[PDB]
Write a structure and sequence with these properties.
alpha/beta; binds 5'-deoxy-5'-methylthioadenosine; Nucleoside_phosphorylase_d (chain C); S-methyl-5'-thioadenosine phosphorylase (chain C); MTAP (chain C); twelve-stranded mixed β-sheet; nucleus (chain C); homotrimer; purine salvage (chain C)
Amino acid sequence: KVKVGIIGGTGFDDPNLFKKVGVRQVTTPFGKPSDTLVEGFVGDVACVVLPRHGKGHLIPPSEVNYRANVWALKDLGCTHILATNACGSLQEDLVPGDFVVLNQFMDKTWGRENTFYGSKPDSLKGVLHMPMAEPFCERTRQILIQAARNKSINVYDKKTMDKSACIHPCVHAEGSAVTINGPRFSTRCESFIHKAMGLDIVNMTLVPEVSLAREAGLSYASIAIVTDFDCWKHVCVDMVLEQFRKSVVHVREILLEAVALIGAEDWTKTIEANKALVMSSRQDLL
Amino acid sequence: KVKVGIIGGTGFDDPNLFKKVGVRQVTTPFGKPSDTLVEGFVGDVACVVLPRHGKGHLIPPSEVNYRANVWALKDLGCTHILATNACGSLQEDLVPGDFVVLNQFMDKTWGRENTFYGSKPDSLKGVLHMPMAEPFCERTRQILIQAARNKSINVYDKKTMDKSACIHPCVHAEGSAVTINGPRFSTRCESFIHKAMGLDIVNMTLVPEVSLAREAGLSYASIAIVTDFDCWKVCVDMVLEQFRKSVVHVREILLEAVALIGAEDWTKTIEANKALVMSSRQDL
Amino acid sequence: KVKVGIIGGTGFDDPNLFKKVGVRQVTTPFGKPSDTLVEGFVGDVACVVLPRHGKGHLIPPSEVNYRANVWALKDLGCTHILATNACGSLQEDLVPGDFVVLNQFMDKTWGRENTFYGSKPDSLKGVLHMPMAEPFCERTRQILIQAARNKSINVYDKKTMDKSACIHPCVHAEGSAVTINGPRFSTRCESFIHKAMGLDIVNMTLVPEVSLAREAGLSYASIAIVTDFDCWKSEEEHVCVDMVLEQFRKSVVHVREILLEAVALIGAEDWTKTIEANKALVMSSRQDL
Ligand SMILES: CSC[C@H]1O[C@@H](n2cnc3c(N)ncnc32)[C@H](O)[C@@H]1O
Ligand SMILES: CSC[C@H]1O[C@@H](n2cnc3c(N)ncnc32)[C@H](O)[C@@H]1O
Ligand SMILES: CSC[C@H]1O[C@@H](n2cnc3c(N)ncnc32)[C@H](O)[C@@H]1O
């Protein structure tokens, strides 16, 4: 049976997705998650919410315990994780107030625990080399886009639609993220180099969250909230929080509809393949 | 009033900038600085100098306590930091013996403490997300450039001048650095990749020093010394003589830059520096 | 005079290279190596082999003690290190089953000890800034290439041969590697970005091994084994552990043949000046002295 975990980032401290049924404080083999987990239901579908940066946003991106957050949701029997991520746009048609259902990323983070497996005592025994060519669960990506359509939110696909058909605010049907380590924002030089590489948005939290989700055998998809233009075009904290304020109502609608849409389908084969993928990536056993 | 801290890179392990008035062996919340801080004056202007690599150049770039160095200067009441940074050139017009007053960078460092704030036990409490689009203090950059002019050094600005102004040796009035972790120098493949990205010089020490200075509310500017062509493109005695001549020039730039800083009002700039820190605290 | 160390990667967790003469259980000032080191002879040349990931391949690329592996081989008197490195191809002409005698790299690793020297108690006292423009030992590179020829394996030299002269499987006489930190494989986005930078292969273990060998005054060369296309070529078999191990199975005998012949070729030459130069480069790179 399906159970959807939700990891909320900047601006999503009041998800208001369901009346809470229960509240749970857990530990994992990798430490404590960012905060208490809040439990409830969307229809018949069990749902669990946690704030990535903890209540009060005291934890910076580089210090978030991504391993504990993902493993805590796995241990509650989540089959899916939906994530929100505030980001800066590197592209003219990705405008503050738009959303992006990411399908690609380039990793520029460092110093974070990015795998559950290793040779040290605070990791699980083994060597896990996971395929990441298409790093998200494509089924769950498409459910996020379909949820946007079902809630009458514009969807823009730059492959099949002229730029003049891009009506803001819109959900972009694809996009690539560069994940930088933070906590500072990029220089103009860095922003132009990321733009020249063809990346669409920049953010501090996607990785290693997406990677650990796949290690945990979970279907993961992110909805990126464009809160600013990165400085190739000026981003600051107050600018980001103000835009997320204007966009959070849509984030809620999409996530709410997405959970219901997940629950309406059979995931048996996908889940079995998620699990089999973890086992076939163990080099120490092969 | 103003007080200018100076962080001396390679070639400045024992700077003879001013008569030593006092010395300060301090400890910061983030550990010990690279060495004792030397206090004095340039005319009327208070000044503090420390060698980034310590006496004897025993501390490699990745192990320099950038947080302690910057915070120690802040605790002494510095309003500005001037820094020197030896570098390799990535471009044909940047020649050994030239200098660069950097205005941009691309960060390839890792494993260094690059922020004063966090939830970790060895940081101050808070989440600080600093804007860094133009990461230096532009007033202080122009002062280093003017100091070079005042000491009869050629200044070349490829935005406002044609190539005829690029007469060596010259101070390049803008430039972008890639900061690598070291300690090894780049491969030819790495050098060509950085060149293709349009970067001007490569160095090991600019970041996180520039980042932490802005976190500390301080105006910061770097004068980079071109010591070599990086290996995209040489007896040691000639290299050392040329570096020696470059150090004389940089010493003159720094002393003149301190006097230039002391001659202007910085009230509003300093208030803006501090306000940028406060408005960058997301946890508040 | 000469003694050749060998660091075996994937496919070499049990090297099986020569008759075991001595088994060394050692420690270094930087900790324990990945496994015991096996000493013996290839023909008349002394040789030492160790598995980079240890016997069970329980040590991931990010956690290998590169410093201890290299220093341990130095302490046993090695003058040379030959390394194998499994990799994915970023280029149409580098096909699974080919090998690459690397001559360049771009480093995207982090969090690994990459130098013997520093100011902390677990390093040697000093500051070493090594030049790395051409980061391999060129004589030892050419010996790997000659060893392929002596064993009737195709050699492809893009500088002197046309694209239609590339016959697979072949040893490529040059190539650039991007070293990523792992353990995950690259995304499609990352793979196309590395390809656009002109890199030839992607791998997780070359760096800092190559850098520390030069710091130790040793001649180092890597033979990269193309086990997959990296995921830019989606119309091919997508990279995974199982595919890598399967291709390595089909290639390992030829890798051993090149290694064993290269060891013999190294012993057949004089290295007095090259070793003196390796050592002098270390001393002239000390910036505390
Ligand atoms: C509160 S502003 C910083 C937070 O917003 C995100 N963010 C928004 N815009 C950007 C940007 N232009 N670059 C990087 N991260 C950004 C980051 O992931 C971070 O957690
Ligand atoms: C004492 S030599 C090492 C110093 O040289 C500087 N440097 C000079 N040239 C280069 C270069 N081409 N690449 C990197 N760093 C360099 C680095 O910042 C380092 O502190
Ligand atoms: C078992 S597959 C992963 C191992 O082989 C190497 N390898 C093979 N293919 C790749 C690839 N496409 N990218 C990165 N490393 C690879 C890595 O260095 C690692 O030790």
